Amino acid sequence: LVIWGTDVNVAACKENFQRFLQRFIDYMQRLGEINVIGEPFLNVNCEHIKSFDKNLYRQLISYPQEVIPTFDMAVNEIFFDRYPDSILEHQIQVRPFNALKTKNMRNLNPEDIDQLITISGMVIRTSQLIPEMQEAFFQCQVCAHTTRVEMDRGRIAEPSVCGRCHTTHSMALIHNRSLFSDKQMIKLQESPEDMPAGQTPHTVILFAHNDLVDKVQPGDRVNVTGIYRAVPIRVNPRVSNVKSVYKTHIDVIHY
């Protein structure tokens, strides 16, 4: 019937939320202005639907790396069929907006390895735009023919595995479909709501990867709902040894 290894239903919303979309209408002007303006990053709010059924809400906080992309295709399918003469140059990514205020922001247990969290703090330091290296292509020397092997969709090509022949960045840099991303080093500052001043405040390294960079000014209010991540820190570049402690870092998904 279906493979349950990824915990993914038929769009997870076809029988649950897509019919709600044609049921929720029964403010036209407010939802329709999305089409006219052509502004990406849909900014849905905290799901009050969760009070009736948790399962709908619980599947967008368990495996968000494999669920948020799913919402993107669902939005486009209706939008293309309804308004084919719209701005198709900008792909639209659904992003939660003002999600559930996580209780005990300081007390983040490592149990929530990959779950949405909401931090509330300030911005201290910001870094200049930094690109990030990803999979590239090589240069053949046989009959001058470009052979596609990994072009076919369906495979998972994670980066950092094939960092060889960087000379490709001199000539074929544009043609490799390797548009570098943007990252901004950001250091949040916990604001414990006028705590009696007991323990020290926890710093969290914020490293937004999306193209939303710089829209956050230093020293402001923080309503950043993000996705927790953990990566292993190399002990020394000279060796391959890896220590059994991981650094916290949070990806921003928010307007």
Partner: protein
């Protein structure tokens, strides 16, 4: 050296059919409820009190003590094997780990003992097990833990001196390949591990293919981890020794309990760590329980004559006898020995903050007594003024060789927790250090936007200051604010200022030469026919007096208030160098702290008014 099946059966029976009646006088299956909760993911940590085990199996307790890791793993496996029979429904998917675990079990059963075809025991736990030290084992001193006790469950006490922040540590690493479709598990025990390259999947075993694998953090097990350094209690360290530091690692629910400067009790397994000319290894302590008090939640006149007699004549007379007199100055030390530990629970933390200052180190060699205060005073730790560089109190980031990734360390103030803090060579301290003391006067509001310091120090000790005279003795002709270059306002913040002028009093000088011989000359040190006693007991006599917790009189305040009116007018009208202000008010109330507790009358209080005054009179006109 025993059949492990029999021991597993014994622990199974012990867990299944033991109970108590202490729970509201009702049998509630003490371990049974905890097992039920563990099976239902209602509880994360399981504690096994060895005392209950000893109630019917002392030999098991001794065997456990002789070897801790092996019995720990055996108990963990037994609990894991006892859980499934208590499952009642479908998992409510508490977190991602439970989701992955239930899919793994469902898929394994879907394909309905091979050595390499089973999940590692640590991967499918979702529970943590720890041992609480049995009461039989007396606490041990850190110096006495040597290589001979490696692998033995021990308990040691100390003070937390260097605690890092909570970070995740990896137990089982999850690997997936793009050709196998299975899951590869690599349990990690050492702090270092090597990422895999070639997948060990059975499918690739046949094909000998490339099998390039990618590490993932999805289904990996994570547990909490901390690094803390603990140092010996100063009360039991010998005078001819120094305290030693031993490393303690705490994991799981047991974390986030220690704070710097707090007395903790630690129990764990003493194990060596390799770091990848012989076989070298370090030592650490994998804590299992950190324990607070349980009982804290809520005298005949024919035997001795102690409380009727003033402590100013009795307590002073056997403390610091080598001091060359100056007993009047010593009286304040008695106030300092009392401190402000006994405080009302209303946020008045300034009661224990007594910032006493002394000017003049060469004076009658009083620099010697400063060290003596820390050693004899209990619940106090030795402190140095300028014994090291500036890195000793603040925090910085430098290179490391053994360990330490941006770890946080405490300073001198944190070193002595709610006790007596001694600082020497005040002049030699830089202005940055001088502000740091001044920050304590501002009632502990330490907020710093600098990268290396963002801490809030728990300054609850008492700050004792000794000031050298600046390149010369006090000048009678020159008044303050002109002869001393440092602003008086900085010194004004200090509550008490003391200086001793070495006057040519020939009669007094005669006494010292005779007095200096007596020390270590005979065994009659308390000359007032006091029995020699054991030196240990002298401190214990003080402790029972503090436990009485008497009550000061409230009505006594109004009578003293009338006295203050005259005191203000005469002090101001003099217009001399010595002057007072509203800060005197703090001193007066602080005076009653030690004075009124001593008198256990509770009927009429009159003498305290003159006694409080008499303390000010010596302070008055001290110049």
């Amino acid at each position: 050296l025993k059949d492990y099946a029999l021991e597993k059966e014994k622990v199974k029976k012990f867990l299944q059919e033991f109970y108590q009646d202490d729970e509201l006088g009702k049998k509630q299956f003490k371990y049974g409820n905890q097992l039920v909760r563990l099976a239902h993911r209602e509880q994360v940590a399981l504690y096994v009190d060895l005392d209950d085990v000893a109630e019917d199996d002392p030999e098991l307790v001794d065997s456990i003590c002789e070897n801790a890791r092996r019995y720990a793993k055996l108990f963990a496996d037994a609990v894991q094997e006892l859980l499934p029979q208590y499952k009642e429904r479908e998992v409510v998917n508490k977190d991602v780990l439970d989701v992955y675990i239930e899919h793994r079990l469902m898929m394994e059963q879907r394909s309905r003992r091979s050595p390499q075809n089973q999940y590692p025991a640590e991967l499918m736990r979702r529970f943590e097990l720890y041992f609480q030290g049995p009461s039989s084992n007396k606490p041990r001193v850190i110096r006495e833990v040597r290589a001979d006790s490696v692998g033995k469950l021990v308990t040691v006490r100390g003070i937390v001196t260097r605690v890092s922040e909570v970070k995740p540590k990896m137990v089982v690493a999850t690997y997936t390949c793009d050709q196998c479709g299975a899951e590869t598990y690599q349990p990690i025990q050492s702090p270092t591990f090597m990422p895999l390259i070639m997948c060990p999947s059975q499918e690739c075993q046949t094909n000998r293919s490339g099998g390039r694998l990618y590490l993932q953090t999805r289904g990996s097990r994570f547990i909490k981890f901390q690094e803390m350094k603990m140092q010996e209690h100063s009360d039991q360290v010998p005078v001819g020794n120094i305290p030693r530091s031993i490393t303690v690692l705490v994991e799981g629910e047991n974390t986030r309990i220690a704070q710097p400067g707090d007395h903790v009790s630690v129990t764990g397994i003493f194990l060596p760590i390799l770091r990848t000319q012989g076989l070298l290894s370090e030592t650490y302590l994998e804590a299992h329980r950190i324990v607070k008090m349980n009982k804290s939640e809520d005298t005949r006149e024919e035997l001795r004559q102690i409380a009727e007699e003033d402590f100013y004549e009795k307590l002073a007379a056997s403390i610091a006898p080598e001091i060359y007199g100056h007993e009047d100055v010593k009286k304040a030390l008695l106030l300092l020995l009392v401190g402000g530990v006994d405080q009302s629970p209303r946020g008045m933390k300034i009661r224990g903050n007594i910032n006493i200052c002394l000017m003049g180190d060469p004076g009658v060699a009083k620099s010697q007594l400063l060290s003596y205060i820390d050693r004899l005073a209990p619940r106090s730790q030795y402190t140095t003024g300028r014994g090291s560089s500036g890195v000793g109190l603040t925090a910085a980031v430098l290179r490391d060789s053994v360990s330490g990734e941006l770890t946080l360390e405490g300073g001198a103030l944190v070193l002595a927790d709610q006790g007596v803090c001694c600082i020497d060579e005040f002049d030699k301290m830089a202005e940055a250090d001088r502000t740091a003391i001044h920050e304590v006067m501002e009632q502990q509001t330490i907020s710093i936007a600098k990268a290396g310091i963002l801490t809030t120090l728990n300054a609850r000790c008492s700050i004792l200051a000794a000031a050298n005279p600046a390149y010369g003795r006090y000048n009678p002709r020159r008044s303050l604010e002109q002869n001393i270059q440092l602003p008086a306002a900085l010194l004004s913040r200090f509550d008490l200022l003391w200086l001793i002028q070495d006057r040519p009093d020939r009669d007094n000088d005669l006494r010292l030469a005779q007095h200096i011989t007596y020390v270590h000359q005979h065994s009659r040190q308390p000359p007032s026919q006091f029995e020699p006693l054991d030196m240990k007991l002298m401190r214990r006599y003080i402790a029972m007096c503090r436990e009485k917790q008497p009550m000061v009189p409230e009505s006594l305040a109004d009578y003293i208030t009338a006295a203050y009116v005259e005191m203000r007018r005469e002090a101001w009208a003099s217009k001399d160098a010595t002057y007072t202000s509203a800060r005197t008010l703090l001193a007066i109330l602080r005076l009653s702290t030690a004075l009124a507790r001593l008198r256990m009358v509770d009927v009429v209080e009159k003498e305290d008014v003159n006694e409080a005054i008499r303390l000010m009179e010596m302070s008055k006109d001290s110049l």
